[PDB]
Symmetry: C3
Subunit: 177 residues, 3 copies
C-alpha cells in the first residue's frame, strides 16, 4: 500500500493514483475529450469552434494549476488559472444567452449531435468541478480554488451553448408526467 | 473546509459539492445526457425514441427525489419515484427481450451508433446506481431506495435495447481468447 | 446499511454496490463501451478494428480477474491477466508510434470522430486504472495488480492510436495562450 500505484505531480513529488489532485486534473482531461467529441461529431459553426478550442486550451492551464502544488516563493512563477479566465467565460455566457427564450424548467438533453454532446460535456465538466473542490478540501493551502470556479462557469456556458445548438428547441421535463 | 465548494438541495439546505446525494443526482444528469447522445447520434425507431424520452423524463423525477430530503409531514407532498416506474421498466424489458436469442456470455459493446451508445448509457446508468446506493448509505432514513432500484432496472433495459439495435448481433467474449 | 445495495462477486460472495473491486470492473465495462463507440462512430481501418476488438476481449478478461478473489489452491485455475497481455499492448504501442512525429506538448483532443472518441476512451481507461489501483489498495493480497498495469499500458496505446487517426495532426496546447 509501494511504488506500484503511484505517479508524479508536476514538481516530481510522488502521489497515489487515487490522489485528489490527480483525480481533479484527470477529470479535466476527460472533460477536454468530451468537448473534442462535441467538435468532431457535432459540426459546429466557426465561432463556436473557436470558443470551444479556447476552452480546451484553458483546461490544460487548469490541469497545470492543479498538478502544481502552491508554494511560498517558487523557483519560477507557476502557470495558474486567473480571474480573467472566468470573466471571459462569463462574457461568453452573457452573449450566447441573449437570444435564448426564458426557461422555466429542466430540458431533456439531446437534439442534434452537437447539442447532445454539449450536454455530455456539461455533465463531465460538472464532475470535474466536484473533483476540483475535493482537491481543495484535501489541500486547502496547496490547491487553488480558481480551477473549480472556472469549471463551475464552464458548465453554465456549455448549458447555454447546448440550447443555442439544439434544433429541437427546449424539450421540457414534465414532473411525474 | 467555507461557502466555497457548497451548494443547495431542493429544500435550500447547504451541502458540499461532494455530497453523496448531489453526486447521485449529478450522475443521473450524466446518464440522461448519455441517453440523449444515443438518441441524437443513433437514429432510433419511433417506438424506441418514445421509450427513451419517457426514461429521460423519469431521470429528472429521480433527481428531484434524490435532491429532496425525506421528512415527516412535509409542507407539500414531494415528487418521488414510485414502484409503478419500475414496473413500467420491467414491462419494457420483457417485451423487448422476447425476440432476442438466448445469450450465454458477455457481448463486446459496440455495433451501430445506436447500439454502441446504448452500451455507453448502460454503463453510466450503472455508475449512477452505485452513487444512488451511496446516498442511501449516507442517509438511510432521508434518501429513498427507489431511485437506485429504478436505475438498476434501467440498466437491464438498456442492455436489452442495445441488443435489439445491434446489427452485428451478439459478438461474444472469448475468455482468454 | 441490509441486502438492498449488495450484489455478488464471481465466487458468489456478497459485496456492496460501492465495493472497490466492483467499481474497478464496472469502470472496465465503461471503458469497453467507450471503445465500442469509437469503433461504431469512428470508421476505423481493418487493422485498428482488429486491435481494438482484441482489447475489448481483454477487458472482459480483466473484469473476470478483478471479480474473482485470489485464493490459495483454488478449485479450478482462475482466468487472470498475464504479463503476455501487457507485452502485446507494448508491441502495438511501438509499432503504431513509429511513424508519428515527436511531440513536445499536450494535444487538444478531438479531430475525426475516431480520433476524438479514442481520446474519450483513453480518459475512461485512465479512470478505470485508478479504480483498479484502489481495488488493490483495498485488497492487497486478494486482487492482482496486472489489471491495473494492463489499463496503464492501454491508455498509452489509445493516445498513440488517436494520433494515428487524427486528420488534424497534433494541435498543440499553448500554455496561458
Ligand atoms: C499533470 C500531468 C498530466 C495531466 C494534466 C496536464 C495539464 N496540463 O492539463 C493529464 C492527466 C491531462 C495528463 C495527460 C497525459 N500525459 Co501527462 N503529465 C502531467 C505532468 C505530471 C505535469 C504536466 C504539466 O502540466 N506541466 C506544467 C506545464 C506548464 O509544463 P510545460 O512548460 O508545458 O512543459 C510540459 C510539456 O512540455 C510536457 N511535455 C513534454 N514533452 C511532451 C510529450 C507529450 C506527448 C505530452 C503529452 C507532453 C509533453 O512536459 C512538460 C513538463 O510537464 C507531466 C510530468 C511532469 N512531472 O512534468 C506528465 C507528462 C507531461 N505526461 C505525459 C504523458 C505521456 C501523458 C499522456 C499521453 C498520458 C496518456 N496516455 O493519457 C496524456 C496526454 C494528454 C494530451 N491530450 O496530450 C508525459 C509526456 C512524455 C512522453 N512519454 O511523451 C509526461 C512528461 C510524464 C512522463 N514522462 O511519463 N498529464
Ligand atoms: C437538484 C438540482 C439539479 C439536479 C437534479 C434535478 C432533477 N430534478 O433531476 C441536476 C444536477 C440535474 C441539475 C442540473 C441543472 N441545474 Co439545477 N437545480 C437543482 C435544484 C437544487 C432542485 C431542482 C428540483 O429537482 N426541484 C424539484 C422539482 C419538483 O421542482 P419543480 O416543481 O420542477 O420546480 C423547479 C423547476 O421549475 C426549476 N427551474 C425553474 N426555473 C428554471 C430554469 C432552468 C434553466 C432550469 C434548468 C430549471 C428551472 O426550479 C424549480 C425549483 O427547483 C434547484 C434549486 C432548488 N433549490 O430548487 C436547482 C436549479 C433548478 N438548477 C439550476 C440550473 C441553472 C441547472 C443547470 C443549468 C446547471 C448546469 N449548468 O448544468 C442544469 C440543467 C439541467 C437540464 N438538463 O436542464 C437553476 C435554474 C435557475 C437558472 N439559473 O436558470 C436552479 C434554480 C438553481 C440556481 N438558482 O442556481 N440541477
Ligand atoms: C463480474 C460480473 C460482471 C462485470 C465484469 C465481467 C467481466 N468479465 O468483465 C460487468 C460489470 C462487466 C458485468 C456486466 C454485466 N453483467 Co455481469 N456478472 C458478473 C459476474 C459476478 C461474474 C462474471 C465473470 O467474470 N465470471 C468469470 C468468467 C470466467 O466466467 P465464465 O466461465 O465466462 O462464465 C460466465 C459467463 O458464461 C456468464 N454468463 C452466462 N450466461 C450469461 C448471459 C449473459 C447475458 C451475460 C452477460 C453473461 C452470461 O456467466 C458465467 C459465470 O460468471 C456474474 C455472476 C457470477 N457470480 O458469476 C454476473 C453475470 C454474468 N452478469 C449478468 C448480467 C445480466 C450482466 C449485464 C447484462 C448487466 C447490465 N444490465 O449491465 C452486463 C453485461 C455486459 C456485457 N457487455 O455483456 C448475469 C447474466 C445472467 C442473465 N441474467 O442473463 C450474471 C450471471 C449475474 C446475474 N445472474 O444476475 N458483469
Ligand atoms: C443546479 C444544481 O445542481 C447542483 N450542483 C451544483 N454544482 C454541481 C456540480 N459541480 N455537479 C453536480 N451538481 C451540482 C446544485 O444542487 C445546484 O443547485
Ligand atoms: C453483473 C454483475 O455486475 C455487478 N453489478 C451489479 N450492480 C452493478 C452496478 N450498479 N454497477 C456495476 N456493477 C454492478 C454484479 O457483480 C453483478 O453480478
Ligand atoms: C501524465 C500524468 O498523468 C498522471 N497519471 C498517471 N496515471 C494516471 C491515471 N490512471 N489517471 C489520471 N492521471 C494519471 C501522472 O501525473 C502522470 O505524470
Amino acid at each position: 500500500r509501494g511504488d506500484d500505484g503511484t505517479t508524479g505531480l508536476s514538481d516530481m513529488s510522488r502521489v497515489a493514483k487515487t490522489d485528489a489532485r490527480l483525480v481533479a486534473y484527470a477529470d479535466c482531461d476527460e472533460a477536454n475529450a468530451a468537448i473534442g467529441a462535441a467538435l468532431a461529431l457535432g459540426h459546429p459553426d466557426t465561432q463556436i469552434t473557436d470558443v470551444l478550442r479556447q476552452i480546451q486550451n484553458d483546461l490544460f492551464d487548469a490541469g497545470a494549476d492543479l498538478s502544481t502544488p502552491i508554494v511560498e516563493n517558487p523557483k519560477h512563477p507557476p502557470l495558474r488559472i486567473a480571474q480573467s479566465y472566468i470573466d471571459r467565460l462569463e462574457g461568453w455566457c452573457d452573449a450566447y444567452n441573449a437570444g435564448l427564450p426564458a426557461l422555466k424548467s429542466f430540458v431533456l438533453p439531446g437534439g442534434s449531435p452537437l447539442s447532445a454532446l454539449l450536454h455530455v460535456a456539461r455533465t463531465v465538466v460538472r464532475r470535474a468541478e466536484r473533483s476540483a473542490w475535493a482537491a481543495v478540501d484535501a489541500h486547502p493551502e496547496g490547491v487553488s480554488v480558481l480551477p473549480a470556479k472556472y469549471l463551475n462557469r464552464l458548465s453554465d456556458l456549455l448549458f447555454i451553448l447546448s440550447r443555442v445548438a439544439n434544433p429541437d428547441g427546449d424539450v421540457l421535463w414534465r414532473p411525474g408526467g
